[PDB]
Design a binder for this molecule. Structure first.
Ligand SMILES: [Cu+2]
Ligand SMILES: [Cu+2]
Ligand SMILES: [Cu+2]
Ligand SMILES: [Cu+2]
Ligand SMILES: [Cu+2]
Ligand SMILES: [Cu+2]
Ligand SMILES: [Mg+2]
Ligand SMILES: [Mg+2]
Ligand SMILES: [Mg+2]
Ligand SMILES: [Mg+2]
Ligand SMILES: [Mg+2]
Ligand SMILES: [Mg+2]
Ligand SMILES: [Mg+2]
Ligand SMILES: [Mg+2]
Ligand SMILES: [Mg+2]
Lengths: 328, 328, 328
């Protein structure tokens, strides 16, 4: 089979690809390096993170149904922990976790057949208590397996996007001092016992898009134009989310993320089950600022789950008009 | 276009309307006044509330797909805060939030086209940390945009209800003294910092229907007769819910609340995503008392999420019969 | 009508039955005895439990749509509490709760018509605060009402399982001393006030399958062979869950659990609403160990929500292959 070597790009962007496969099955080659580093979640909040390829989430991989995925995974000698990878897209050996455990200084190559279309989570799962801990330290991303003929709607009609954005939502459990301030550690292992105690409450300290509070706002705001069909692929590897585009809708939504199921239409808010990825297409109709949020608004605003989309184009007064301006 | 002026009625009731539109598109005119007042959630629990039209939830608006909605929103001079409105039914300007910010003593008129059929949340969203806070202080309601030809089932067959009840479920975060008792404040702003600390735990002190524990029980119990097709429209603007009618089912359920999607049948329990409204139709078959509950039973019983429905009519022993009475 | 007397078997197993009804409607006779006993959830964690038939969950009942269910429920004189039963499968009298309240030393016989196909929760619901408390002490199980002609897929094609496993997931709220250790009590009533305080936080101390941490792992691991179509019926009577088979998928999933609705395909993770049962069919394609988990991995690993499935058969390198073994 042809081999295609991909250069991954950091989230929320996606590597070059075609929606309709330009060929028959290929072997898709990807490589990622695991990076353990402290990351700043918020102004005075830091996470002893563990990442695929230096980003939270890990980068988006895009292939077609019936392709193979050949991943080279590298755990550099400077890392402290063993790591591996479980693709929810894959069949067998705990998603590949059983075949990919690598120590610092080792690398491994896994091949699987992408037999099922949809957006899927991938995450680290080295075993026992390590599983939740590695995930909530940042080790999860998404692979999207498109149908060979591209996406289809609830009636089997071909559907096309202009842009995909990968929104990786992640919950984190940063320990606190009695006064509410966040603790700092020298490395992941040092912070482990304190982190577990927070994990046990099931209350995240932060819930973020793209690895940090405000990462996709201000200078990181997403961009589009009136008329653009934008696919928002949304992963949550550990906890539920309820995405909502403020000012918009989900035109076609696969909330369970699997493309051969019929999408729902006209949604205000949809539901990403923890341990899954979903996808929503929207055609922008009005210019201006939109917020893409987890619609538990405490999670959106206090915890960090808010992105902005800045949209250019002409305003349509038939859809909405301020008839009487604030007056009094 | 014809203009139709509506008189809103408090929840769980609905203003006069027709399921099948008796005309082509109209401009629907509504008016609401924002009322800031302390409300009693429970025996020794009070909320510094902020409300649309004096009720929690805000009143239900009912229009047809392709109509316009023209809302006059009034923030009386006695209020302390700026307020606005985001309709999830609307397209643009953050659902209208960007065009409706009004200070105490001001009013505003917004028009939008109700382009999509379904039950939708509306809520206050004045910006930043104000967003979750105004919502969890009571500022959310629902607008139902019916298809012009009325509801249709999973097979496109016309479906009709005898009664709609609007169940507005709301989570609240009342601060507590060390001994578990609830704190009281002079106004919303005074209670703000203490409320935020509760919000951060993501654990509501109360989760209520119609603004208070027991509001829809005893004297407030809902009523129906055997044979009645009752539509239960259920909103939750901030947190997930799992409605269940104890003793009944959802005959047709749109849990994501958007009427052009096929409903599911025969449900025991359905799922309202935080930041959305859903709808369930049930035809009553047995007389007696029913409980409509959020089926996290701690949320139902300890937090306040229980309504009763009292149903009159004849008992059917073929469906259920006590064969041997408690004996021993 | 013919009467059929069933011998229940403990979970995760199911009593003898046929998927396609070998006859017209029958009256299905079941009997269960309520057992109040302390149970060990985990190494140093015990629950003052209240059970149907001595198991958590209560045993699975299997009947066909249009059958009757006649249940004899027995509350032995050694018990301390009144108990009853609410079948979500049933119509009227709070699912039967209104007709089945029995004191220690009493028994009752309830008949209902199983008019709706699907997996349904049954649980104890003796009234008021007793409701959540009896459920979170273990009093819930599942009844599966199969269509008379067996299961059908999203296209109406007949579908057949080789094995059903009933996974009863239950959240528990065991009180703790200041040092994090769990408290012990002489009986359920003694532990009540302390348990309520934990219930109020909505944070379970344990979330288990089959009544205990590790119950379905090691010696209790589930078993299958490559090629087996296994139906996983999953109940959660009080709290949401997000089941995921690590290394596999849901081939056909009814997450709301009602068999006349079309199932979704190829799911990675699905969603069981608190107060419901859902069902997922998977055909095993690879041998080895699988984990069936609630995919909030903290709930899976720290709280107890993990089962293992051990699968025998031949490995398929086309689906997955370790191309380069860990090396360095
Ligand atoms: Cu790792
Ligand atoms: Cu996983
Ligand atoms: Cu407001
Ligand atoms: Cu909103
Ligand atoms: Cu009981
Ligand atoms: Cu129930
Ligand atoms: Mg690279
Ligand atoms: Mg400090
Ligand atoms: Mg230090
Ligand atoms: Mg008025
Ligand atoms: Mg006090
Ligand atoms: Mg004072
Ligand atoms: Mg027996
Ligand atoms: Mg102790
Ligand atoms: Mg003692």
């Amino acid at each position: 089979l042809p081999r295609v070597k991909h250069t991954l790009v950091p989230p929320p962007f996606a590597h070059a690809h075609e929606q309709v496969a330009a060929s028959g099955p290929v072997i898709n080659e990807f490589e990622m390096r695991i990076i353990e580093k402290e990351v700043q979640l918020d102004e005075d909040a830091y996470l002893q993170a563990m990442t695929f390829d230096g980003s939270i989430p890990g980068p988006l991989m895009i292939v077609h149904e019936g392709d193979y995925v050949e991943l080279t995974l590298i755990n550099p000698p400077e890392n402290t922990m063993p790591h591996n990878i479980d693709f929810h897209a894959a069949t067998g050996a705990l998603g590949g976790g059983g075949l990919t455990l690598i120590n610092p200084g080792e690398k491994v190559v896994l091949r699987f057949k992408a037999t099922r279309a949809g957006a899927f989570v991938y995450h680290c799962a080295p075993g026992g208590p390590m599983i939740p801990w590695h995930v909530v330290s940042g080790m999860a991303g998404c692979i999207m397996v498109l149908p060979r003929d591209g996406l289809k709607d609830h009636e089997g009609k071909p559907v096309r996007y202009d842009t995909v954005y990968y929104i990786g939502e992640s919950d984190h459990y940063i320990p606190k001092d009695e006064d509410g301030t966040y603790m700092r550690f020298s490395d992941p292992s040092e912070g482990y016992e304190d982190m577990v105690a927070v994990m046990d409450t099931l209350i995240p300290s932060h819930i973020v898009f793209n690895g940090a509070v405000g990462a996709l706002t201000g200078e990181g705001a997403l961009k589009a134009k009136v008329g653009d069909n934008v696919l928002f692929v949304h992963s949550q590897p550990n906890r539920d989310s309820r995405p909502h585009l403020i000012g918009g809708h989900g035109d076609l939504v696969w909330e369970t993320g699997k493309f051969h199921n019929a999408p729902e239409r006209d949604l205000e808010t949809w539901f990403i089950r923890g341990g899954s990825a979903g996808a929503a297409l929207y055609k922008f109709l009005q210019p201006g600022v939109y917020a893409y949020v987890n619609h538990n608004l405490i999670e959106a605003v206090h915890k960090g789950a808010t992105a902005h989309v800045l949209v250019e184009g002409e305003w349509d007064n038939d859809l909405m008009e301020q008839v009487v301006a604030p007056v009094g």
